């Protein structure tokens, strides 16, 4: 018994039967009104499903979704216009009706979405997913116009609103043509995707998809909503503890809900991946905006703790007795400049060969610094640096040459506050750069007396520059045939008077000069 409504559908129903017949048998209601006892029932359901499937294909979904050519595409592609009445009420309730009647061309699914933030964050992922398994479909979100009663679908404002949606995708390109599709012309064998959304309740109605692939799509949707719900641990222990409720909504209170939950991957790209969390923000879409700042909070402490231990390991290591150059840079950055001193390098004529004297000057001051308790800091394997670790902190020194001056800088790094400042300041009183320069110059002056520098001009320069004479020096100078010449000509001699003070006399045209650090009567007696 068959209805007379499908009078011209004789070929069409011949292609939806040899199609829905081959599921068990191997090789509204008015319009569709060897165990032989159940064979007739089995054979009738196949014809009923064939009639239903032909109804949707040939009388429900050949319609349009929504200068002449411009409006002939925006209406075809549903970008501009309004959704046809078919995809408003009849299509959903008819495809769903293709469930009670046995029919292997329609699927179903569901979801929970414990909150409805994630609808934008589910739609894009579903679009990418559909495009990946089949680029044929084109996602169109036909939201119902607010306040409109029925078919009004204009391609979340006003919260607490049970937002409708009709996320749809279809083979726009393959029109005028109705392994991907499960069926084929046995007839409008075209497929369709319909994803109705009612508040927090998903519903898939994949039709004519490949069976395995369609089931995979549904399961992927299920897993996607599962992962999105698992990305309610912002809800759990970011939002909840933003009010200071660390004990109330803990972790694990879903396949992605396990005691071993990778927080970093689920505060990242919204998908299922193909320090304690329960006090993270203690005393420091909305998912990627709320957990993103948590990530920064958790990195800004990891880096700080990386630096803090570097600060302390060197302290303890040096307090008992080749650190990297970057370590030195960090040490200087973390420390304060306290004092400095510079002095002239007179042997250079330009400041009125010389480099070797500067290095010699460099070494003899280094040896002085060690003699008061300073340790040389070796340069790490890929300018002299000395340290003196103290219980109060670390005191560092730098030696370098710029232009024609010798500069020493004293850093400090605290780690009883005055117990480090006094230690810092006392070293400043012991630098004695002026006296050291005085003595070094006088000693080097006694390296030509004993054997083309104009020694007279240099002596005049030195006398003018330091007429007084530092109190911490030891050497002395006085102005006013056993001689020796000096290419003008100057007479020099050297007797080792020990009244102990090595002394010498130099005379040139009759001007004469007499050349004779610690923490004169012999200068004038030598006549």
């Amino acid at each position: 018994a068959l209805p007379t409504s499908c009078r011209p559908w004789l070929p069409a129903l011949a292609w939806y039967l040899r199609q829905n017949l081959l599921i068990f048998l191997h090789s509204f209601e008015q319009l569709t009104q060897i165990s032989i006892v159940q064979l007739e029932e089995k054979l009738r359901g196949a014809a009923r499903q064939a009639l239903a499937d032909a109804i949707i294909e040939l009388q429900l979904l050949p319609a349009s979704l929504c200068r002449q050519k411009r409006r002939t595409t925006q209406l075809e592609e549903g970008e501009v216009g309004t959704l046809h009445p078919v995809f408003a009420r009849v299509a959903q309730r008819w495809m769903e009706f293709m469930v009670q009647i046995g029919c292997a061309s329609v699927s179903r699914s569901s979801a929970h979405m414990v909150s409805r933030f994630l609808l934008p964050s589910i739609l894009s992922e579903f679009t990418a997913l559909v495009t990946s398994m089949a680029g044929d479909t084109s996602v169109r979100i036909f939201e119902q116009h607010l306040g409109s009663e029925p078919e009004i679908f204009g391609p979340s404002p006003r919260p607490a609103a049970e937002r409708h949606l009709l996320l749809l995708g279809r083979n726009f390109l393959q029109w005028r043509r109705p392994a991907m599709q499960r069926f084929e012309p046995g007839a409008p064998r075209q497929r369709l995707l319909l994803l109705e959304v009612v508040d927090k309740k998903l519903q898939l109605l994949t039709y004519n998809w490949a069976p395995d692939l369609g089931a995979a799509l549904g399961r992927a949707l299920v897993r996607l909503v599962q992962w999105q719900n698992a990305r309610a641990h912002l809800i759990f222990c970011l939002l909840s503890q933003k009010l200071g409720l660390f004990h109330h909504y803990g972790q694990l209170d879903n396949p992605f809900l396990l005691p071993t939950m990778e927080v970093e991957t689920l505060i990242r790209s919204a998908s299922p991946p193909l320090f304690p969390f329960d006090e993270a923000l203690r005393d420091i879409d909305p998912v990627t905006y709320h957990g993103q700042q948590f990530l920064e909070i958790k990195m800004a402490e990891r880096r700080e703790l990386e630096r803090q231990m570097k600060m302390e390991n060197l302290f303890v290591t040096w307090q008992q007795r080749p650190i990297s150059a970057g370590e030195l840079e960090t040490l200087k950055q973390s420390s304060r400049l306290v004092h400095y001193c510079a002095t002239a390098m007179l042997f250079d004529p330009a400041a009125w060969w010389l480099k070797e004297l500067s290095l010699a000057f460099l070494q003899q001051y280094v040896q002085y610094l060690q003699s008061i308790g300073f340790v040389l800091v070796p340069l790490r394997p890929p300018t002299y640096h000395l340290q003196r670790a103290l219980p109060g902190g670390i005191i560092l020194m730098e030696l370098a040459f710029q232009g024609c001056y010798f500069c020493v800088k004293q850093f400090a790094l605290e780690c009883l506050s005055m117990l480090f400042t006094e230690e810092c300041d006392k070293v400043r009183d012991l630098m004695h750069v002026h006296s050291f320069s005085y003595d070094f110059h006088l000693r080097l002056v006694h390296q030509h007396v004993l054997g083309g520098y104009h020694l007279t001009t240099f002596l005049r320069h030195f006398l003018a520059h330091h007429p007084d004479g530092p109190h911490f020096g030891r050497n002395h100078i006085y102005q006013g045939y056993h001689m020796k010449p000096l290419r003008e000509y100057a007479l020099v001699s050297a007797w080792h008077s020990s009244g102990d003070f090595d002394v010498s006399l130099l005379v040139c045209h009759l001007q004469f000069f007499v050349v004779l650090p610690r923490l004169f009567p012999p200068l004038a007696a030598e006549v």
């Binding site: 200087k332 973390s334 400049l337 400095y340 001193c341 710029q402 024609c404 500069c407 506050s417 400042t421």
Partner: protein, 383 residues
Amino acid sequence: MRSVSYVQRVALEFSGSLFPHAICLGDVDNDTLNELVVGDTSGKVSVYKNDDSRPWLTCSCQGMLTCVGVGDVCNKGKNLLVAVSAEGWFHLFDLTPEQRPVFKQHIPANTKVMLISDIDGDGCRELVVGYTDRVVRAFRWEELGQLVSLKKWMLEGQVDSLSVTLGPLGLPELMVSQPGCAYAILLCTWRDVVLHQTIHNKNVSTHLIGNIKQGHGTESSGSGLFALCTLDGTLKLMEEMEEADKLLWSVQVDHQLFALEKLDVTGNGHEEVVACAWDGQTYIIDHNRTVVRFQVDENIRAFCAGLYACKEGRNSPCLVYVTFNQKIYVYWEVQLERMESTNLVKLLETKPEYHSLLQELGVDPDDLPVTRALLHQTLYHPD
């Protein structure tokens, strides 16, 4: 007595070391808008303008800047940027519409501080420098032009800051900090260095500021107040007056004070003393010992208070901190409606017409509950 929490601030990126004396704020482009000058040891000076994170401009000296400043040192009526290095060099910059200076001259090395002011009273502005070895040197500009040396002073205690304030005779002076909460007065760039003491460790570091305003419109010519701070944590404000100093007030704190500036946050003409410690505990004290404490939860390398042009092209009071994480924080909403803490009942009592306006209302302002009931009715139930 009370603490506050300033909110709005500008963070400027700045990598390099500096001395607590190599930062200042002043007008370099001559537009009545202040910029920020910072001089670091690597051989670069950065000027910050408006509120851009990056520096407005850079100046390339030759080595190890030790002090920077801005002022009319050439006595041409304009403003110029002065930079002094460690080996006694001296650079001039004309930043008015890379960046090599326009003038170079060598001076004695071991420079530590800077001051630019008319110290004698001749009407020409002179330059004063302090050195690491208790030596102070004065200079002048002379048209040719060149820097000509002048009187030079020897001291015993370490010099940390130089300032110019009005003397008892109404003439500019030159004062220099001396350890042990002391200071030395120099004498004239025509026995030689007078000393005064204000008990703690005799080697305690000390900083000094002077020329504190006392009214509105007196900035043209006026001083008399100066402030001293010590590392052990004592602060003092004193007045020159005639014979010796008068101790206006003294305060003992429990931090390591290392800076001293003056600002005007209330905006009533008077200038408040601003001090900062190594741990970031900023103190702001008016001339009546009304302390306001701000606490930036960081560690401080350098501090600077003054007028600055941050937003909408208009000078505003500002505080400037340098931190160990290559960041300079500029706090610029720092204006305070008042210093102390008060309420409407006391504030409305000061105005005189209130007692007439309420006696005409029959209510005798002798019962505080009635007054507050009436005020609540007036403010919250207008009809």
